[PDB]
Amino acid sequence: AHTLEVSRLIIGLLMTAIVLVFAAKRVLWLTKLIRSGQKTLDENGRKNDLQKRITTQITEVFGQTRLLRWSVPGIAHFFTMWGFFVLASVYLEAYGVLFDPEFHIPFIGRWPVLGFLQDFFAVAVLLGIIVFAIIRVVREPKKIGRDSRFYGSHTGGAWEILFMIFLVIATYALFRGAAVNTLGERFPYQSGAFFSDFMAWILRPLGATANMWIETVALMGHIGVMLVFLLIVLHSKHLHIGLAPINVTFKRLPNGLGPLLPMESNGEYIDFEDPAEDAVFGKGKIEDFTWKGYLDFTTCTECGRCQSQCPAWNTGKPLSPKLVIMNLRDHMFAKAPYILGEKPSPVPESGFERILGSGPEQALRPLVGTEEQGGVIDPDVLWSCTNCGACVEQCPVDIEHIDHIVDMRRYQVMVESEFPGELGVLFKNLETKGNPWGQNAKDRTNWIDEVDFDVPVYGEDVDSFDGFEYLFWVGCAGAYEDRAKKTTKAVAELLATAGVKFLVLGTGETCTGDSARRSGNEFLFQQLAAQNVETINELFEGVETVDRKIVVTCPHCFNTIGREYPQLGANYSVVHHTQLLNRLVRDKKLVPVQPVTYHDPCFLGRHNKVYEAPRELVEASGVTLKEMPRHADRGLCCGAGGARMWMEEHIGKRVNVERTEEAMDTASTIATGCPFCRVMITDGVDDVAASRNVEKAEVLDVAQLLLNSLDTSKVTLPEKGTAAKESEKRAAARAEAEAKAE
Ligand code: HEM
Ligand SMILES: CCCCCCCCCCCCO[C@@H]1O[C@H](CO)[C@@H](O[C@H]2O[C@H](CO)[C@@H](O)[C@H](O)[C@H]2O)[C@H](O)[C@H]1O
Ligand code: SF4
Ligand code: SF4
């Protein structure tokens, strides 16, 4: 009897002490690795607005708002997660019982309610394991292939952890029954605890004689399994247990979408007019990723939520947001001895596994390189991204895939000088003519000559911004592209009908650089953005920050002029034409008098969270809006973002074709909100219709749908030169008033 009395403590304590040495030896090692990355300046090192960071950390972690969006797995994880917190109380009882069998949680160790929660969660976690187990059996990668949410994931490590949770419950159940039989009335939860009472009933026949050994065997298993399970987690892909709460603390706010962060080197922003000799552009090796970058890599849960939504992955291309993180994460660990200084420096779509081990070959691999180069990330993976944002919008742990993808592009374009040959034409056209098409700058104001109403042009006829409300910014697409130019005229006509006083910079405009920045060429973007910020700033001289209004017809201008120029000192209030037109129809300025489908632009919908305004215009125009199977924040890319408009799709199905086939199945009329969405979808309709041998679907812009519904017969738009005459009158009147006074 006494042998079991003391043996419980002798085995229990040494197991804890021995394991905590190994467990604590790796916690320092992981910390020594995650903190070995480059430091960060963004948001004061991801520390500004601290109070709001824990506010989202608690809501996203404990509330699981970010995670419950996927119903079946999120709900199961909710009980799996909260169970761990509750079962933590059990381990306190188990450890204390070693010192004395009468031990119980002093303050609450006999409260009947706490027993119900432990028992309720003791089986709720069991369901969580089953629900997770069923999903992987149904979605088996070997049975489904690339369509599987778990393709490329390490299935071996996922089942290993699920098995250990089962043992913890199985050992937990055995202890509860054994404890009741041995302790009897002295058992802490003598009342309630149905799951603990249930076990005692089945274990009762063995009697107190047998259960004396069962309790000790069960207990040592409960502590032993946990300690053995603790070591597995630290050395397994399950690291998101402790890192996930931290990766959400330092998350990019409000989300990992929107503007592209300025480049920094070793904790300092790069001065592009005087970059330092040691300045590093982009990220050409795993050591260039910041300490936050390493945290993202290790926090990946390999859930595949991002992968199931990637336009590139689902159209047959090697790119996968999951595998990019996994390949970077695995490369990070494989190269760890060289990063930490321990050694002196010397599935087919998963690029890391091309070179394995931590030998010298791992240290010499390019971060981005073809198979013959052994690179971790194939160039087709890197250049297949469209910057749609489906991965970032979907990550429960806020990994910000786009930041890593375009930070690697920055190295290729700006340092390595390697990029698809189709971007070479883009950069030469932008840097010589100011537009990606390479057309003459003098032809920018041609679209003004093709309309029959007055569109004042700053510098050309009107000398100042006085008396005007909005700067209408067209962009290269709205001035040079035949189909996009159609929308620009419609928007200008709508504003004139609504009476909004506006002007256009005309030939003083140049490319914003959204394609230039997201292709990785930030030398070009800073060269183009600086010209636009300076050009616009002169227009708004003497204009209060509130009145510095801009209206754009492209989500990319909306995203760049509004969110990325402020990094250069801008304070512009830019609004997409759908928002401006929506509140004009709201304000009864515009009076509109079979089904239609709307394609959400990823830079309008997903990045800038503009969903209701474009759809209200569609409804206000009298047509019936039919949502696609994939729409709103789960919309699909047409393949135009991230400079993919200028490259060519060699691999797999064409993204615009996949979207168009879905769009045409929904309705025969498609409404878009971007110059590039219209071009891609319109081109896709030509391919899809020809393949299907059916009449082409009508692709229009939400501005054109609104205009067609207006009864413009009663409206007389301003005659050409009307704004010029007013400018002369105001200028002449002011001159006369001052001349006659002085
Ligand atoms: C705090 C205790 C936690 C426990 C005990 C726990 C446990 C688990 C386990 C065992 C899985 C495997 C699911 C499967 O194999 O299908 C899982 C999945 C996951 N966990 Fe946790 N986790 C915890 C914390 C967190 C937190 C705070 C987050 C924050 C986002 C998180 C995010 C995820 C995600 C995204 C998945 C993937 C779910 C899926 O594949 O559908 N975990 N968790
Ligand atoms: C069961 C799983 C167990 C997981 C075990 C491993 C845990 C790893 C913990 C490390 C977490 C990252 O820890 C993070 O490190 C960074 C990098 O220095 C610190 O960063 C801090 O110092 C750096 C420089 O040293 C500054 O640039 C930064 O502005 C400042 O915040 C963060 O304050 C800290 O939050
Ligand atoms: S990157 Fe995020 S969404 Fe994708 S598998 Fe990893 S944890 Fe899941
Ligand atoms: S941004 Fe879109 S295309 Fe790029 S990796 Fe993420 S999901 Fe794929």
Description:
There is one protein chain. The chain has 31 helices and 10 strands. It is mainly α and 742 residues long. It folds into 3 domains: 201 residues; 155 residues, Fumarate Reductase Iron-sulfur Protein, Chain B, domain 2, CATH 1.10.1060; 292 residues, no CATH class. The protein has a 4-stranded parallel β-sheet with strand order 4-3-5-6, with helices on both faces. The protein has a 4-stranded parallel β-sheet with strand order 8-7-9-10, with helices on both faces. A two-stranded antiparallel ribbon has the order 1-2. Strand 1 and strand 2 form a beta hairpin. Helix 5 packs antiparallel against helix 7, helix 26 packs across helix 27 and helix 27 packs parallel to helix 30. It is elongated. The protein starts with a helix and ends with a helix. 43% of the residues are buried. The site of one iron/sulfur cluster has 14 residues, from helix 13.
**In oligomeric terms, what are we looking at?**
monomer
Gap from first CA to last CA:
114 Å
Bound molecules: protoporphyrin IX containing FE, dodecyl-beta-D-maltoside, iron/sulfur cluster
Strand content: under 5%
Structural class: mainly alpha
- Major beta-sheet overview: 4 strands, parallel
The portion of residues assigned to helices is 40-55%
How many strands appear in the DSSP assignment? Answer: 10
Read across the widest sheet, the strand sequence of neighbours is: 4-3-5-6
What is the molecular shape?
A: elongated
- Return the domain count: 3
- Helical run tally: 31
Rg calculated over all Cα atoms = 31 Å
